[PDB]
Amino acid sequence: GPPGPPGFPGERGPPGPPGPP
Amino acid sequence: GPPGPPGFPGERGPPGPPGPP
Amino acid sequence: GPPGPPGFPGERGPPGPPGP
């Protein structure tokens, strides 16, 4: 048969690194 | 034939950008 | 039929905290 539907999106990424001084 | 099952979940998103100065 | 393709990537992370 035909392929199933696409899976769900992943979760959100982690916070970025601290900013420069 | 019947369509297949849903796909695997997406991967986690990328890390965020650097914070402000 | 075969399983569907994997999902799309998640949301971009939040910006980082202010620098020193």
Coordinates of N, CA, C and O in Angstrom, one line a residue, chain B:
Chain B
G1 N -4.1 -1.4 -1.5 CA -3.8 -1.7 -0.1 C -3.9 -0.5 0.8 O -3.9 0.7 0.3
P2 N -4.1 -0.6 2.1 CA -4.2 0.5 3.0 C -2.9 1.2 3.3 O -1.8 0.6 3.3
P3 N -3.0 2.6 3.4 CA -1.8 3.4 3.7 C -1.1 3.0 4.9 O -1.7 2.4 5.9
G4 N 0.2 3.2 5.0 CA 1.0 2.8 6.2 C 0.7 3.6 7.4 O 0.0 4.6 7.3
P5 N 1.4 3.3 8.5 CA 1.2 4.1 9.8 C 2.0 5.4 9.7 O 2.8 5.6 8.8
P6 N 1.8 6.3 10.6 CA 2.5 7.6 10.7 C 4.0 7.4 10.8 O 4.5 6.4 11.4
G7 N 4.7 8.4 10.3 CA 6.2 8.3 10.4 C 6.7 8.6 11.8 O 5.9 8.9 12.7
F8 N 8.0 8.4 12.0 CA 8.7 8.6 13.3 C 8.7 10.2 13.6 O 8.7 11.0 12.7
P9 N 8.7 10.5 14.9 CA 8.7 12.0 15.3 C 9.9 12.7 14.7 O 11.0 12.1 14.5
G10 N 9.8 14.0 14.5 CA 10.9 14.8 14.0 C 12.0 15.0 15.1 O 11.7 14.7 16.3
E11 N 13.2 15.4 14.7 CA 14.2 15.5 15.7 C 14.0 16.9 16.4 O 13.4 17.8 15.9
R12 N 14.7 17.0 17.6 CA 14.6 18.3 18.3 C 15.2 19.4 17.5 O 16.1 19.3 16.7
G13 N 14.6 20.6 17.7 CA 15.1 21.8 17.0 C 16.5 22.2 17.4 O 17.0 21.8 18.4
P14 N 17.1 23.1 16.5 CA 18.5 23.5 16.8 C 18.6 24.5 18.0 O 17.6 25.0 18.4
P15 N 19.8 24.6 18.6 CA 20.0 25.5 19.7 C 19.7 26.9 19.3 O 19.9 27.3 18.2
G16 N 19.3 27.8 20.3 CA 19.0 29.2 20.0 C 20.3 30.0 19.7 O 21.4 29.5 19.9
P17 N 20.1 31.2 19.2 CA 21.3 32.0 18.9 C 21.8 32.7 20.2 O 21.2 32.6 21.2
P18 N 23.1 33.2 20.1 CA 23.7 33.9 21.3 C 22.8 35.0 21.8 O 22.0 35.6 21.1
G19 N 22.9 35.2 23.1 CA 22.1 36.2 23.8 C 22.6 37.6 23.5 O 23.7 37.7 22.8
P20 N 21.9 38.7 23.9 CA 22.4 40.0 23.6 C 23.6 40.4 24.5 O 23.8 39.7 25.6
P21 N 24.4 41.4 24.1 CA 25.6 41.8 24.9 C 25.2 42.1 26.3 O 24.2 42.7 26.6

